[PDB]
Design an enzyme around this catalytic site. Structure first.
Site, mmCIF file in Angstrom:
data_model
loop_
_atom_site.group_PDB
_atom_site.id
_atom_site.type_symbol
_atom_site.label_atom_id
_atom_site.label_comp_id
_atom_site.label_asym_id
_atom_site.label_seq_id
_atom_site.Cartn_x
_atom_site.Cartn_y
_atom_site.Cartn_z
ATOM 1 N N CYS A 348 -80.961 -34.711 -40.426
ATOM 2 C CA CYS A 348 -79.525 -34.464 -40.392
ATOM 3 C C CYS A 348 -79.213 -32.997 -40.139
ATOM 4 O O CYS A 348 -79.583 -32.124 -40.929
ATOM 5 C CB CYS A 348 -78.871 -34.914 -41.707
ATOM 6 N N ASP A 389 -74.080 -50.363 -45.716
ATOM 7 C CA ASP A 389 -74.639 -49.250 -46.476
ATOM 8 C C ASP A 389 -73.908 -49.120 -47.813
ATOM 9 O O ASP A 389 -72.712 -49.407 -47.916
ATOM 10 C CB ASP A 389 -74.507 -47.937 -45.682
HETATM 11 C C1 HEM Z 1 -74.596 -36.637 -47.836
HETATM 12 C C2 HEM Z 1 -74.131 -36.653 -46.583
HETATM 13 C C3 HEM Z 1 -75.037 -37.054 -45.410
HETATM 14 C C4 HEM Z 1 -76.129 -37.850 -45.421
HETATM 15 C C5 HEM Z 1 -76.765 -38.594 -46.638
HETATM 16 C C6 HEM Z 1 -76.616 -37.887 -44.056
HETATM 17 C C7 HEM Z 1 -77.705 -38.598 -43.630
HETATM 18 C C8 HEM Z 1 -78.193 -38.555 -42.360
HETATM 19 C C9 HEM Z 1 -79.370 -39.297 -41.913
HETATM 20 C C10 HEM Z 1 -80.202 -40.246 -42.812
HETATM 21 C C11 HEM Z 1 -79.556 -38.998 -40.619
HETATM 22 C C12 HEM Z 1 -80.667 -39.518 -39.666
HETATM 23 C C13 HEM Z 1 -81.662 -38.368 -39.549
HETATM 24 C C14 HEM Z 1 -82.882 -38.807 -38.773
HETATM 25 O O1 HEM Z 1 -82.730 -39.247 -37.612
HETATM 26 O O2 HEM Z 1 -83.998 -38.750 -39.330
HETATM 27 C C15 HEM Z 1 -78.517 -38.063 -40.217
HETATM 28 C C16 HEM Z 1 -78.388 -37.535 -38.955
HETATM 29 C C17 HEM Z 1 -77.284 -36.843 -38.536
HETATM 30 N N1 HEM Z 1 -76.249 -36.409 -39.343
HETATM 31 FE FE1 HEM Z 1 -76.067 -36.684 -41.278
HETATM 32 N N2 HEM Z 1 -75.798 -37.086 -43.254
HETATM 33 C C18 HEM Z 1 -74.810 -36.563 -44.069
HETATM 34 C C19 HEM Z 1 -73.780 -35.717 -43.684
HETATM 35 C C20 HEM Z 1 -73.552 -35.310 -42.412
HETATM 36 C C21 HEM Z 1 -72.483 -34.439 -41.986
HETATM 37 C C22 HEM Z 1 -71.491 -33.869 -42.992
HETATM 38 C C23 HEM Z 1 -72.571 -34.284 -40.655
HETATM 39 C C24 HEM Z 1 -71.712 -33.453 -39.673
HETATM 40 C C25 HEM Z 1 -70.938 -32.442 -40.055
HETATM 41 C C26 HEM Z 1 -73.716 -35.059 -40.204
HETATM 42 C C27 HEM Z 1 -74.169 -35.166 -38.920
HETATM 43 C C28 HEM Z 1 -75.349 -35.757 -38.531
HETATM 44 C C29 HEM Z 1 -75.857 -35.798 -37.178
HETATM 45 C C30 HEM Z 1 -75.128 -35.183 -35.962
HETATM 46 C C31 HEM Z 1 -77.021 -36.445 -37.167
HETATM 47 C C32 HEM Z 1 -77.969 -36.753 -35.951
HETATM 48 C C33 HEM Z 1 -79.005 -35.619 -35.859
HETATM 49 C C34 HEM Z 1 -79.992 -35.779 -34.723
HETATM 50 O O3 HEM Z 1 -80.341 -36.923 -34.302
HETATM 51 O O4 HEM Z 1 -80.448 -34.721 -34.239
HETATM 52 N N3 HEM Z 1 -74.284 -35.665 -41.296
HETATM 53 N N4 HEM Z 1 -77.694 -37.806 -41.306
#
Ligand code: HEM
Length: 399
Positions: A348, A389
């Site tokens: 993330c 979820d």
């Molecule tokens: C507690 C809050 C959050 C949790 C538990 C969470 C969890 C995750 C998870 C499990 C993934 C997949 C990572 C992987 O492919 O291994 C992810 C990817 C991502 N998250 Fe979060 N996230 C959170 C908050 C956020 C926030 C606040 C943002 C944006 C401001 C965000 C943007 C993204 C993006 C853009 C990806 C894709 C990254 C990539 O493929 O390069 N997330 N997140």
């Protein structure tokens, strides 16, 4: 082969299937909504392998990609952003927006994060609960991450509340398909307008950096800038809302640990680490298709076969996390990372941001509202439907 996604065992619990699979069949086949077959990986070590293997792909036009719904097969037709890319394209684009999310950048945002939390808590205090319980989601859990990510993207103060409600309508379980699509187009239409304005006069925000550093030199075009901004908005916001609501419910369920947190607010970071392991509110994002045959555990995954790696199951893996089904913010952590935010290159982008938002929330909430109380019986909390979820739709509280 059992149909997947599995349903949660109850409101706050992961699906019952993961514990049994980790014990008896850690790499197994499951049946997706269209009758197709994908591999399901359940153990922490194997999930990390899936997340980092260069034999596996995130490109959704490859054969066998495990879409989980008919809308996802639709979404696979659109032009991808970095969430759906492999190297070298993945970091080529991801690096365009990563600077705002580095630990140093998030450190410098801490005064603004605190201000945002304080302002919203004070509004909730002034509104009061003198006429009955208020919904902590609407009053607090929803606007805290919404206001922050919108402000980072470049939304001015006066537009925050409307866009906050439109984005909430986009994923609300009670919205009709027409209501959700309308709210979705409202967000896209607005970001297009904002991109045009920052192309003419950039300001200090993410969209302006994209416009000056990538759009104008021709590295991407303005529709790409919209799609990347849209991803940053929608990728994490609903998960942030659920994590805040789940944290409040979890503390109500564990009054001894709430007592410790009230007596020592500096326990917020450890509380947040355990929350993110125990409640894995984003558990379906680590998906791949095999570019070539690849061995995982005792299974051979053939080229063009799909894979889902459950970080939710990884975070309850008894081999890694002693007594994994107990919530304990005082636990001693092993060397292995909890996977609430994924793993590997795609981990993330907002992990530090999210942990700072959650840590700010839980080091402040009970200092503002020492008598904050869930107003309904805990067994009656309105969780997300069990086929989705884990999360909370609404949470009546008094204080
Ligand atoms: C507690 C809050 C959050 C949790 C538990 C969470 C969890 C995750 C998870 C499990 C993934 C997949 C990572 C992987 O492919 O291994 C992810 C990817 C991502 N998250 Fe979060 N996230 C959170 C908050 C956020 C926030 C606040 C943002 C944006 C401001 C965000 C943007 C993204 C993006 C853009 C990806 C894709 C990254 C990539 O493929 O390069 N997330 N997140």
């Amino acid at each position: 082969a059992p149909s997947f996604p599995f349903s949660r065992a109850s409101g706050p619990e992961p699906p019952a299937e993961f514990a049994k699979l980790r014990a008896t069949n850690p790499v197994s086949q499951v049946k997706l909504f269209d009758g197709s077959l994908a591999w399901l990986v359940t153990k922490h070590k194997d999930v990390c392998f899936v997340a980092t293997s260069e034999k596996l792909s995130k490109v959704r036009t490859r054969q066998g990609f495990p879409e989980l719904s008919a809308s996802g097969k639709q979404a696979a037709k659109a032009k991808p952003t970095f969430v759906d890319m492999d190297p070298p394209e993945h970091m080529h684009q991801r690096s365009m927006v990563e600077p705002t999310f580095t630990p140093e950048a998030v450190k410098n945002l801490q005064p603004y994060i605190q201000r945002t939390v304080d302002d919203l808590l004070e509004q909730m205090k002034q509104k009061g609960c003198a006429n009955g319980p208020v919904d902590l989601v609407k009053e607090f859990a929803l606007p805290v991450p919404s206001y922050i990510i919108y402000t980072l993207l470049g939304v001015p103060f006066n537009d925050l509340e409307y866009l906050t409600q439109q984005n909430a309508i986009r994923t609300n379980g009670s919205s009709t398909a027409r209501e959700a699509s309308a709210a979705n187009q409202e967000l896209l239409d607005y970001l297009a307008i904002l991109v045009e304005q920052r192309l003419v006069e950039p300001k200090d925000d993410i969209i302006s950096k994209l416009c000056t550093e990538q759009v104008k030199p021709g590295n991407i075009d303005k529709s790409d800038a919209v799609q990347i901004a849209f991803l940053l908005l929608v990728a994490g916001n609903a998960t942030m809302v659920n994590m805040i609501a789940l944290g409040v419910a979890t503390l109500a369920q564990h009054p001894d640990q709430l007592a410790q947190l009230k007596a020592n607010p500096s326990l917020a970071p450890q509380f947040v680490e355990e929350l993110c392991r125990y409640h894995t509110a984003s558990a379906l994002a680590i998906k791949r298709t095999a570019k070539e045959d690849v061995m995982i555990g005792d299974k051979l995954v053939r080229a063009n076969e799909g894979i889902i790696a459950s970080n939710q199951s990884a975070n309850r893996d008894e081999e890694v996390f002693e007594n994994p089904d107990e919530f304990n913010m005082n636990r001693k952590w092993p060397p292995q990372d909890p996977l609430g935010f994924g793993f590997g290159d795609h981990r993330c982008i907002a992990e530090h941001l999210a942990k700072a938002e959650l840590t700010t929330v839980f080091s402040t909430l009970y200092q503002k509202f020492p008598d904050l109380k869930v107003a309904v019986p805990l067994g009656k909390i309105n969780y997300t439907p069990l086929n989705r979820d884990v999360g909370i739709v609404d949470l009546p509280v008094i204080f």
